[PDB]
Amino acid sequence: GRNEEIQAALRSQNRAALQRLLERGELDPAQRVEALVRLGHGGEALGEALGALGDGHSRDNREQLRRQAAEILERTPQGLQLGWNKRDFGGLDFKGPTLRAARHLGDDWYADLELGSGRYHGDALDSSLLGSERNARLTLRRELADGFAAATLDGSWRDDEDRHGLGVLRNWRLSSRDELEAGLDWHRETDETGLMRALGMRDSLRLGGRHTLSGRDQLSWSLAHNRFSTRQGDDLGNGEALSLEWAHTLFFDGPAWQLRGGIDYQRNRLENRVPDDLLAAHGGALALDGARSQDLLQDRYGQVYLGSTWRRGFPGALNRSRPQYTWIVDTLAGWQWTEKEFNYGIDLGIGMELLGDDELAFTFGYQSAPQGGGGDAGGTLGVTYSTRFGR
Amino acid sequence: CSSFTSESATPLARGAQWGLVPLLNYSQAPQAGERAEQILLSVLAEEGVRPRLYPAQPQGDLQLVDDRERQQRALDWARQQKLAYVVTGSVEEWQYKNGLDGEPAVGVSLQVLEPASGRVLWSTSGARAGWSRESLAGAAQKVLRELVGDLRLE
Amino acid sequence: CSSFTSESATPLARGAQWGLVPLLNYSQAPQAGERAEQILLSVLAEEGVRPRLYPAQPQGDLQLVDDRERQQRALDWARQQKLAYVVTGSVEEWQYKNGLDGEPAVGVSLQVLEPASGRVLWSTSGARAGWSRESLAGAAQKVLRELVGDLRLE
Amino acid sequence: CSSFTSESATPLARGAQWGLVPLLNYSQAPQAGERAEQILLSVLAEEGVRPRLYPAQPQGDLQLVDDRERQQRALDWARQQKLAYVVTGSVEEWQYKNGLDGEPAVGVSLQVLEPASGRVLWSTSGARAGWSRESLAGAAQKVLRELVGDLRLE
Amino acid sequence: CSSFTSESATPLARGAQWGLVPLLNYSQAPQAGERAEQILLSVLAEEGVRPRLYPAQPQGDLQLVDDRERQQRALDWARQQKLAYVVTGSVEEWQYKNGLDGEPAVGVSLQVLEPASGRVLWSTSGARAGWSRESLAGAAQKVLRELVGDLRLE
Amino acid sequence: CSSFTSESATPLARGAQWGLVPLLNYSQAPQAGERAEQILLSVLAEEGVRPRLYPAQPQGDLQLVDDRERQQRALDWARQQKLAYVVTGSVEEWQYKNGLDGEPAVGVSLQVLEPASGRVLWSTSGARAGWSRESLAGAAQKVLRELVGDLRLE
Amino acid sequence: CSSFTSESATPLARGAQWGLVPLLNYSQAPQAGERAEQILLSVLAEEGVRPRLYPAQPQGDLQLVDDRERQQRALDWARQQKLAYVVTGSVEEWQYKNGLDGEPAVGVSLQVLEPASGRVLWSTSGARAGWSRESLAGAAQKVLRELVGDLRLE
Amino acid sequence: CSSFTSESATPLARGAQWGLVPLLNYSQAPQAGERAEQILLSVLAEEGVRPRLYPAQPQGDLQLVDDRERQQRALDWARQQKLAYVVTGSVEEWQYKNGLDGEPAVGVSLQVLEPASGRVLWSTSGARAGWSRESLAGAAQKVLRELVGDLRLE
Amino acid sequence: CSSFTSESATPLARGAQWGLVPLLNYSQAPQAGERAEQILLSVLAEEGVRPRLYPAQPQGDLQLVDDRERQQRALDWARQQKLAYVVTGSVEEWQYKNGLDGEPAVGVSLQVLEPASGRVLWSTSGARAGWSRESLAGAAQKVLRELVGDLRLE
Amino acid sequence: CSSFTSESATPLARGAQWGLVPLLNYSQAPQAGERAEQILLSVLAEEGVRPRLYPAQPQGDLQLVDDRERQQRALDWARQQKLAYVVTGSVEEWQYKNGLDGEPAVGVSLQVLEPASGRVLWSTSGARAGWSRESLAGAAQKVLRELVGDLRLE
């Protein structure tokens, strides 16, 4: 037959056969979109999918087109988002508005702009010197035949000291079941501790991979070597970080139910003493008394956790991928053997479509033992309104 | 999201001899007129109206598919039996949309005619884009309830 | 999400000779009328009602013979056998939706007639769009239970 | 995104004998003219206008039948009947826009003609696309209401 | 995710001459009635019931022989053998979901008939949409176990 | 994830003349009954049962030959000899499931018949949805081992 | 991820006249039986068993020449030659898992028949779903090594 | 991922007059036997063996001619030439596995026969896969080198 | 991203008897020449040039009349009319490049000839790949405005 | 990312009566030989060589063109014209590699023949997979410049 050969070409990843079938215009719209995804053109895939989802075509073509468009929008959303976020790191938080925009600037280039202002309200910080933090991050992602390459330009202008960082990432796909990722970081934002987030940068060389051990099981690992310095360019200590996670899916949707279990370990060689300029006494912004080097960066950190997630799409995402509303219930139980403390956390969220092709999302997060919190509980609070670019 | 036309007509008598003529399926969903008629018989019964259904006839030819022909062939029937009122109408939309939400979209128009003269005494149109978690039959039932609900009966 | 019509008629009599006439299939799912018939036989039995089923009179080409005509033959049979009531109706929706949730969607109308005259003594329509984890037969059973559950019997 | 023309003509008289002639479907959606005619009859009734409907005579092969010719036959009918005004029009767009939005897009032109001369006494057109949560029938109803509402009947 | 109807009939006698005729396949899955019968024979054996199976009726053209025609030709055999009871049923759903999880969905009705008169003594319906890692046969086994387990045999 | 029925019958004698007759393939996987029998023969060999296999017979078009016909001839052959017991069964499911996981799903019924009378002495049904990295043949082997394991022999 | 049955039979003698007859291919993979035969030849030679091979003969028609027909002819040949044992078997699975980068899944049964009587002396089944980077031939070789490895030779 | 069988037979003599006959292609890849024969000829010469090739014949009707009978004709040629050893074998797998890595999978069985009697003097099977950045011909060459390398030559 | 040639010929008098003959469509978009001609007529009139349009040729065979031959016949007409100048051109590109941006790509060549001698007094080519949110008609308008603007009109 | 063979022959004479017979097209790109011929003619002129082109011959069936025989015929033409040298060659690869960022891959072999006897005086091969943002014609031009550049001429 002919349709049988088309299906065989689609299944076997015969790039030449897909190219021929696509040029000669003998594929259905869903088959065309599938071939476009297989051949590496994601933007043209999205365009052809969104331009064919109408009454003119037949049943199950509309279904496959809708599903493919939704999954592509999940991977590479197009739209604008306004929101306000509160992240408590434990005794220290960072509030402020955010603005995220993303779109395909051409068929093979994806742009992601994320602007955000904010302020630090923390007991251990002199927030007067740490004025309003204006953050702007541009990420140009180039799609490749066997993965993608991305370059990020993020900057954080502040009265204390401006930070200008650059990051390059290259993701490889060895097979449908294996992916590898290598990336270089230079003067980038941190999240290890609230103090490090507010007063620190990171130069890091990172390796990682994601492996599909079965249809419902995925294994993810990451190896990193990080160098930490203050925003003024004074060393805080280097180290290596290891992460490993196993995710088991019980239901893929309706709602999606996933169980995860993983282990995170970090070992760092801290400097003998924190730089004096950072201390509040010497015209610095570290209001913590004593200011032991562990507070900025822990020499040893470890945790093994089990988690369960129930979700309908992703509330707070740039594009809503489910009909008319989304929600997430994510729970994590952790055992920090380095701190002899059990970490419990829940992440809640809900989204709703207001005017059409949009989403007003509210997200809440709680975490009893944030890393570097020192016994103080962390959490997250956010509200976002997202609108989608597309027909 | 729904839209309904509100009529400025005189209220119609509750206690009366009502008929029920088949509806016109101007939507491209097959058999949607019959589903609308069944849900309309149920919805009218909720308001104390029990119309007399038109007796069906054999269909052995392809020319007996025009809904207008059947509707006239039933209007004359209503004339013979001397009914006071005759409920009919048309189905404008009967489908799930093809967007991300895929909500049910129903559009139905309802008419009440005088069988002898054939004059239109009532005419209302209702449309609804329901919830993505709502069924098509449920959306049609809601639209028909609001159309029959606003019907002025005394 | 579900919706049901609330009939405003008089209670019927449980202790009577109930018939069961085939249900019309206005949905596009094949043999959905038969599935509704079986689940309705099970659901009525749960409420102390045991209808007498309808004899074969085996039909010819199924796709050519009209559903309404088989139903009319069934009402004729019920008229000869001196049945008190006949439960019948139609199926409006019987399918899993094609959206991103794929939930079951069922819409059915239930009608109780007097076999001789044919007057509609009861008419309720129910619709449901269930959970993604729910089966089509389960949703149909739920809708039929609610319709029969609201049936007023004495 | 909606746009409506504003005519500069003198107003028409509500207290006159109106007619209703079929709308010309220049959109590629089949049977959109009849759907627009039903929603227009409902919308006119909201304004207090009760047009006399053309008589629907049978035609030949339904595949090849021109809309202008049927409209002309109905104009001669209205001219025979001494109708002061005749409401008619056309559909330029009747569809959901392609994409995940499921966006209805309706474009309708409304014309009022003096049957004797055939002269156009009124002519306005409207369009509406940018509302993804509503249905096609709802959008058509809103457009027709805006057109009829701007008719400024006196 | 399952639902079952509860019968309101008198308990039956375990120590009786049970039969077993074909189950009607109103689902779209081929040979679903035979699979359901095999799993039902296994399930009844769990409950201490060993029914006499209908004989293999020789047939040349299976298409001409309807499923419930076969059921009738088996009920006559049950009548000749003077069996006290006979287990009958139908398959309404036998399929995996058309989604990412492909959960099994099964719906089966079970009826116990009196072979001589043909009266229905028991009628229960059960439906299940199981877990993602579940077989169709396992879901059918669970449904049939729940149906047979509610017979309240003596 | 598996499911097995527990026969409530007396154990059968290991030290007897066993036979094996072909399984009935009600699954839509071609030649699944032969694979099931081939694995079942090895599984029975673990427990010390060595049934005599039915002889091969010539045929024409295997598609036109009913499975139950061959099973009946095999039962006739078993009755011709002094076989105390005959192992039989049927395959309900033999496939890799549909969905992103694609795990093996096997469902098999195991029955023991008395060749002289044809009476069923044992009847158990097993089903399994195995690990995604498990093979279909391995899952069938596990199911048949559990079914034969539950066939306690004294 | 593999599974193998463990026979309880008495050891066979390595110092005997062995034979090999073709393997039944109940898998739907073409020519899988011949591949299994070659790999079984290699695996048997590894253990010191050198079976004389059946004489091939081209098939006049593929449909007429069945698998079991050819196997019976080979058994007749082995009977003519007065061999002590005939090692044989069947292929139940020879395929990669559906999708991209699916692992190989091999299911093979191994039998040793007495050529004179034709009774089974040995019967083991093995199944394996291998690594994603593993070949079908390698998985079949591992399965056949384990099956032949467990074969008790003395 | 690779796997090889190790023969227990005695070593063969390099100095004798070796032959080479075409390989049996039980893989579905066209002309894989010829490619394997060419690469095997190259690999044997690396060790020091210089087999004489089997002379080809006119095509005529090779469709009727199967691999086994053609190999038997080659063996007749070999015995006519008085060759001590004949290298032969079969191809079980010759393909790129489905996936995004273009991974080659090769399965080759290598046999050495004695033309005087036809008995197998050596028989090994090798398989290779999982090397994504490797050519199919390279994998075949590596497997054949390993098999020819293990062939103990004095 | 646009590109235009700079013609070095002498200025041409604006106050003369201009003519317009059809453009040659070498782009694969049907009727691109007619659209370009309409837009060029609008653009020329904006600059004060009002060419006499060629007559509508009654072409019995549209396929027979090559655009070059139509242009030649129009040149013959222009010679018959004693026109001072004749404007023509060609369309090299008229399409949306699509992908995701859908930007319009328009390429046209403008020629002014002396009809008596047939010489080319003016020759210029322009190309534009406009913005993503641009229409094809707008891009063609911009290109033709640039080309006609570059004419050195007295 | 290219590779070129370096001839070991003696340089030829730039000043001589050269020819250019057509190139063989062993790639699957239609008319790649002609494109290579034009680019080679341009590249030779850059080096000072100005070959005499062969005369076009009448052509019948274009699908039956045998490049070898036509090249040979051009070689006789060169012989009758008394040309010292003839430049020829072949096109092995002329295509864009599949997928995203498909770079142009061009492979050309250049040969300088002696028409007096047909002896090959020069033979080199070049291949280039160019930059992703490179054209096929540009890659061919670069390959031919390298090939003709290394052609030592004195």
Author numbering:
A (entry chain M): 803 to 1193
B (entry chain C), C (entry chain D), D (entry chain B), E (entry chain E), F (entry chain F), G (entry chain G), ...: 19 to 172
What does the paper say about this structure?
Here, we reveal the architecture of the outer membrane complex PelBC for Pel export, where the essential periplasmic ring of twelve lipoproteins PelC is mounted on top of the nanodisc-embedded β-barrel PelB. Pel is the major constituent of P. aeruginosa pellicles, i.e., films formed at the water-air interface, and it plays a key role at early stages of the biofilm formation at solid surfaces. P. aeruginosa Pel is composed of α−1-4-linked N-acetyl-D-galactosamine residues, which are partially deacetylated in the periplasm, so the Pel exopolysaccharide acquires positive charge along the secretion pathway. The β-barrel of PelB is assumed to form a complex with PelC lipoproteins, a hallmark of the Pel system in Gram-negative bacteria.
Here, we employed cryogenic electron microscopy (cryo-EM) to visualize the structure of the PelBC complex of P. aeruginosa in the lipid-based nanodiscs, reaching a final resolution of 2.5 Å. In agreement with the prediction, the complex is composed of a single PelB barrel built of 16 antiparallel β-strands embedded in the lipid bilayer and a dodecameric ring of PelC lipoproteins mounted at the periplasmic side. At the periplasmic side of PelB, two TPR domains resolved from the residues Gly-803 and the intermediate helix (“stalk”) are located within the PelC ring, being docked at multiple lipoprotein subunits. The interior of the PelB β-barrel is predominantly negatively charged, where the charge is distributed asymmetrically, being largely concentrated on strands 11 to 14. As a major element here, a short α-helix between the strands 7 and 8 (further referred as Plug-I) is bent inwards the central cavity of PelB where it lays perpendicular to the barrel axis. Plug-I is opposed by a glycine-rich loop between the C-terminal β-strands 15 and 16 (Plug-S), and together these two loops occlude the exit tunnel of PelB. However, the exit pore within the resolved PelB structure is occluded by the glycine-rich loop Plug-S with a bottleneck width of 4 Å. However, within the assembled complex those aspartates are buried at the PelB-PelC interface and build multiple contacts with the surface-exposed arginine residues of PelB, such as 905, 944, 1018, 1114, 1122, and 1190, thus playing rather a structural role. The anchor chains of individual PelC subunits are sandwiched between two Trp-149 residues, one from the same PelC, and one from a preceding subunit, a configuration that potentially facilitates docking of the lipoproteins at the membrane interface. A fully resolved lipid molecule was located between the PelC subunits H and I, forming extensive interactions with the lipoproteins and the barrel.
